[PDB]
Amino acid sequence: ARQNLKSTDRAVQQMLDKAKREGIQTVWDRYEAMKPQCGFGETGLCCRHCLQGPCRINPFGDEPKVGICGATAEVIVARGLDRSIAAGAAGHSGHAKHLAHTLKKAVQGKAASYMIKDRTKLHSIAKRLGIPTEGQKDEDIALEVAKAALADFHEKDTPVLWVTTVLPPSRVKVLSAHGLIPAGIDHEIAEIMHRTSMGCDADAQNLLLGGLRCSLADLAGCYMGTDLADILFGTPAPVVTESNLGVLKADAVNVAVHGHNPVLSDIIVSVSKEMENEARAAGATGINVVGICCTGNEVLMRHGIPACTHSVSQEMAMITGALDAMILDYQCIQPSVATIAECTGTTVITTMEMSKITGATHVNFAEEAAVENAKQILRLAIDTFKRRKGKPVEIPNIKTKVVAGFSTEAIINALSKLNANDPLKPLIDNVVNGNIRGVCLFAGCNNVKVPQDQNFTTIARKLLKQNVLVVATGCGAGALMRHGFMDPANVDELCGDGLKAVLTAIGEANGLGGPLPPVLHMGSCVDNSRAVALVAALANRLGVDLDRLPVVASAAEAMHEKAVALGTWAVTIGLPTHIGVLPPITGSLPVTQILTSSVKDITGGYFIVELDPETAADKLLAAINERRAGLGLPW
Amino acid sequence: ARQNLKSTDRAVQQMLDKAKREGIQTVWDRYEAMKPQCGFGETGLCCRHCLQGPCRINPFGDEPKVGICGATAEVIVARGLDRSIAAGAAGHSGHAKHLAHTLKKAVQGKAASYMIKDRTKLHSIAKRLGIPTEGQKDEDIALEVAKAALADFHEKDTPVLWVTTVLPPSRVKVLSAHGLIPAGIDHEIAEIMHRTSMGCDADAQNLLLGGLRCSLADLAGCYMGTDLADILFGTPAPVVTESNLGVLKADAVNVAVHGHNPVLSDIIVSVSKEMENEARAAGATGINVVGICCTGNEVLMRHGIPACTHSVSQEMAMITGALDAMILDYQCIQPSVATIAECTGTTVITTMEMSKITGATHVNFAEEAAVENAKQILRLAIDTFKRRKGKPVEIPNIKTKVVAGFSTEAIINALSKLNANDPLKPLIDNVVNGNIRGVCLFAGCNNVKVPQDQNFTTIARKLLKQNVLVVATGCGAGALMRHGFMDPANVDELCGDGLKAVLTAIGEANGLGGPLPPVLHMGSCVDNSRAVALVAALANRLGVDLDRLPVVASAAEAMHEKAVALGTWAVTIGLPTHIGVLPPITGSLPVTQILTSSVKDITGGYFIVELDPETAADKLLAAINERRAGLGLPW
């Protein structure tokens, strides 16, 4: 098998050869077994919203042409998309809610393993929300902030403040005029599920406006999740680490944190340091915590924990034979890990009541007992390391250097070395003079349909040569880090002269003797909210709305319902938004036209659906350059 | 075409012949055009929860055997079912929320068309919730009740009170021990959507326990909806009216209220009386308001408005040519009505922001302007009546007599004529002595897959001959009313001797000179909560839990996601629950076994999946008789 048709990651290719030798089925094998996939589902022309279904509609030809209840193709496609947006929002609802409850418990004395680590961020959030700080104890300000977070999940006398207080007033006014501001996060999720149920909303424009509103409930949960995680665990600052399977160490207890929530992984990191002698008594050098997916990004950004792998290739970390434990909370975990564990020795451990996998070991993890729960979990890992005394392992000797930790606060601080009292101005100056053509955010998943990382790297290379400032989160950041895009040594090879000049000027002012890295890692998927904060701050400084800025987004290999919600709120806040896999919309030309064209007249953003990455890069550059022209700039 | 293969309703058959002559496509034609339907969807073996899909699994044979991410058949089936339960709960969330906001506005002086009509019910609800009434103004008690209703949608320091205060403590304890009490209505909906999204919950038992909990959030919304509608519009008492298409009148302005919420239909009823002279000036005898679906049930139960038709046959009311307006809010409205209106003359009017249909006229309906909005709507209806001056219409001369209005309060009052201070005892006495074998609730929809009404009438006939007390709601009540099961003149033909003796004794004590009807109509689908209140009161009076009572439920022709949620909470509160159409579970034997067997060990209820109605009746009788035996009674 030509493994570069499956992944462009050479460590993943090596593990794919090992999996094939050993007869271990992978995600790529399960994909091949699924082909050809159902074209009704691929196009969006299938509905199972009642027990008269399944209903399908032929994309072309003869009957069936309409659902049994009379639902048209437009209605069926829009309802399916809306449910995907609601499901993404629900994942960020649970994540943010988790952190809100943890902060509340911490300041009520009920969870002593947690505390206010970033007091400055706590006070700035309180100020943004309108919560008074003068004369108040930190623990009382934090209680108020946690209560406000919980209140945004339901209707109240204000709209969702993690929308209205984080976008410029001009953008809030545009959205309010179209009825798009969410009333409550879980309120919107429930209204979507209602209006898309049988015999309810059946007008594509009305349905899609509901979808835009629910996508802003997802943005709110992301921004809430970042705000709360920064309070509890610290705002990221620049860090240096490594990525790819070579960060595993045959002689250590290798423990992957995988899933999403730092409430769990951050404690694993600190406890693992305390249990080092306990690990050495078992014959290991220590506990080697490594990251997979977003929770790996969280501990990479805050602590420099090296990233082992991401998304589609997560099983490969197990195939090395050296992964002693995989510690899970929720989201983006292939349930195949539980069965592969049987073959690879790995102990897969779930920790959250609503996210169990048959055949995994479950260790309930309560914030009230976090340290005790973490020691129980890590002792299972040490037990597993001892069982592989004497077995060979195959860890590919492949890793990259990763400079990361570029929270919005960190970026503003780095820029402030060039202009202390007007930190955004050096960035804007270089946009205006052409040294920075625009900004592109790469975000979202890998997807087995796309050779892993190929779209992220192909599009990133073309944009960097054209002097685009590239930022990245989630498994987009994972794709770019595993291919060297976060190593400043690659600036000369990857970047246009103008962008290199800017990256070098900023880095030298930060005492680096070298540039910032080619791509700025802004964190996890909830940390797409950080990109929003940066873009909104640039909008505010310029006095224009986000739909006038030369800023675009690319979910180049999207997979999860969260990525659909992300793409939709990127459009709703005003960005040209590329998606590099087909969402289930092509069976309705009216819906496609709304999402790629007429929504421009509502929010100023729009989707760019393009599966060829070189063409996608051209289209993203055209969108950036159209925004430049609209500001009167050369391009 | 043999129209009795489509519907057992003879008025519907006549309209099917008219539709065929005129070339108007119906729901049955769209069903035929859909056959054969997709077997992956029929069995539940399809997943579209991420953009790597669609994934399918062959029920038998070779690959594909597992989803791309590793999701097994058990996980895929359970996740799809859970989303259907969440969607049903969301429909009842929106309905109940609507009423809560209306009550709040009414007592805040913001909606003068609405008021506290049932002060006794207001005070009993407040007492059940723990809200003090002594020394308080009604408007303040009502504000507190509305605030408590809204609070149950989100997490707080108590669980959902419209669950914990409406079931016996012993049942609440059983549910709490299994972690099944909902924390908040919209909270549970969002948690379902999260845990069923890609890479989250992947254990069938864990997923299904989440589904049971979310089904109790649906029960809460139903019970909240009934409680609030009774406060605002009056608790039903016995009423006499008629049903079927013959209630339309060629010489009147015929206006159907269709959908769910009495906030709209109840005002239509009162305003239509005030506009009678305005209608006579246009040449009509008056405005003839008729009911379709649940909102028709609501105004039938409270005002005796005749029911025109239900569920699957709703288009047929338009085919008569005499339907001048169809006034819609949300749920169970076939969107085909908007296109059929073009051919039939009918003015289809939507009124709710989240439920529009392309091609219908939209008239926003604000509770603050209810009377003004209703007059605008009814004036469109009068305009339409005038346009059919001189056209022939074909109204089948087919109707039945319907005695209805059996709220739980009404049933208790009727029984109190036999035992004033212990009203449930005469019912229990007749259960014990065999005159009443048990109780069966028929509920839920019609479904185009089943000849309309055939399962409801076939099963009801067999149970009535075996002396089962039969109660009904929703389109189950609609099916039974359109076939004469709500006419006391049919008691001798339909009922066993024991049941006839009881129905006659109760009716004679109520001054009727005749029995109660063969089937007691307990109202709309939210009014399945009334059946809960009756059964819980019987449990309390006997000192046993609901899973010991000889009470069963039958969703004999289920369709909507709401009906899946209903069947699941009937199981969760302890009832043997028949479903007469295949839910998408047969592709997983483990899930089927949980839902039909091992859940007995958790909640004491269980599903009975049986598509043959004579066999279903036997199985329901066996379940009733097993409960009789468990109480030591003859059967």
Ligand code: SF4
């Ligand atoms: S909602 Fe309409 S289109 Fe969807 S399954 Fe039911 S009948 Fe078919």
Ligand code: SF4
């Ligand atoms: S969640 Fe798993 S099973 Fe479902 S579509 Fe995605 S890959 Fe397939």
Ligand code: FES
């Ligand atoms: S027909 Fe294949 S996704 Fe439904």
Ligand code: FES
């Ligand atoms: S394959 Fe037909 S419902 Fe998906």
Ligand SMILES: [Fe+2]
């Ligand atoms: Fe993620």
Ligand SMILES: [Fe+2]
């Ligand atoms: Fe209904």
